[PDB]
Amino acid sequence: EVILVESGGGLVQPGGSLRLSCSTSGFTFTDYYMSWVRQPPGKALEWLGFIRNKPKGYTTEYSASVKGRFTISRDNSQSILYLQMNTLRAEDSATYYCVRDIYSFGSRDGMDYWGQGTSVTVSSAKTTPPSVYPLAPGSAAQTNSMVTLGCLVKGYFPEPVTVTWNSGSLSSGVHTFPAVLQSDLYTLSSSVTVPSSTWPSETVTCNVAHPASSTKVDKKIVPRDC
């Protein structure tokens, strides 16, 4: 199984620099060209550059957009790909993807494997951890059967924040709304719906993660809101 995992993302001040890493496993790293592709929130994918494979001598090439500012390198003994990003500016804020490219021209083509990507935000604003508030129904049941609960994640920076419910167990029935940036701080909420015979008799917890401030919060939803 091919595995690509990016790390290194976070908040960088304008003019700052950052080094991203991509760990790889499951294939012979040196036989492949490797590329970096980025994507600003809500925008198109953008190819940044690649580093060729062993037969081609591992030579590098870059997009005009970052050539002279970003460089790519690879550690062939550890099978790790890097992206050195210098003199950053707002426009560089994006999710950065590590991607396996071709291994030969006549065989096939296409970027067949992609990592999950790592987010980078270029801003002068301060990293701020979130406050996680549990949202339980007010003292008013009404037509029961299914119950909806939620959790409000407020006042954090930069994006993103990851929200799961029972460590992912509660997938489906879950809706996480897009964060809204206010001033220099984001707020979002998440809702989960489960049968009333599940909650509160059984536990429901929302798990929030904010990579940038290396924070992880678990908030159990306890009855008696209002």
Binding site: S35, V37, A44, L45, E46, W47, G49, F50, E61, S63, A64, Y97, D101, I102, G106, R108, D109, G110, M111, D112, W114, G115, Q116, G117, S131, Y133, P134, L135, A136, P137, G138, S139, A140, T148, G150, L152, K154, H175, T176, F177, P178, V180, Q182, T187, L188, S189, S191, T193, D225, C226
Partner: protein, 219 residues
């Protein structure tokens, strides 16, 4: 360099229908020796990473459903999806690999489905938030369609349109419905000098709004 472009920017069809989208390059992507055109198509569902669908203009990646077909050569290409399914909701990108690599701007495929009424839930501010001096009243409007929906907030019977923020989810990949949150944020002090809090949802599916509220004094 080569400029890649796609059209239309967005398209919408119902499940079961066929769709075609186009991609164009500034220069030919055809290699006269191999006779192939170096163009690929990628699918990126909302919130996830891109997936390779087709390469060399018309070769489908093994495992990719046969509903996806790529065609074309030189500077003009197309991606066709026969019998679109709800899960096909995504942005599709073409990319040339003739000289380094360059992506087009993408075509967003939206899904049309039957109208569905929202399920509304209201939540008073948490005791936790009150300790910080703030008070957010939240209302979730889940699993509805079409996207257009109106929320009206009322405090003690009066309409409140200041301090309200709405946020919509992307279309659902399984049922093509939308969900939205409406949040009214006040200071703890103002929140505590009022009693009734109501959110009213007006959607195409009904002439009468769906109202949810609590009294705070009955908390």
């Amino acid at each position: 360099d080569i400029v890649m472009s796609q059209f239309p920017s967005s398209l919408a069809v119902s499940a079961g229908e066929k769709v075609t989208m186009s991609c164009k390059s500034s220069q030919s992507l055809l290699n006269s020796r191999t006779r192939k055109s170096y163009l690929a198509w990628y699918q990126q569902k909302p919130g996830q990473f891109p997936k390779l669908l087709i390469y060399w203009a018309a070769t489908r990646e093994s495992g990719v459903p046969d509903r996806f077909t790529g065609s074309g050569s030189g500077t003009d290409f197309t991606l066709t999806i026969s019998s679109v399914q709800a899960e096909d909701l995504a942005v599709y990108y073409c990319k040339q690999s003739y000289n380094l690599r360059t992506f087009g701007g993408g075509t967003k495929l939206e899904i049309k489905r039957a109208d569905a009424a929202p399920t509304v839930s209201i939540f008073p501010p948490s005791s936790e938030q009150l300790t910080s001096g703030g008070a957010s009243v939240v209302c979730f409007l889940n699993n509805f369609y079409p996207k257009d929906i109106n929320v009206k907030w009322k405090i003690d019977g009066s309409e409140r349109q200041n301090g309200v923020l709405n946020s919509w989810t992307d279309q659902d990949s399984k049922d093509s419905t939308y969900s939205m949150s409406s949040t009214l944020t006040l200071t703890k002090d103002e929140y505590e000098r009022h009693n009734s809090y109501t959110c009213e949802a007006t959607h195409k599916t009904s002439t009468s709004p769906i109202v949810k509220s609590f009294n705070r004094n009955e908390c």
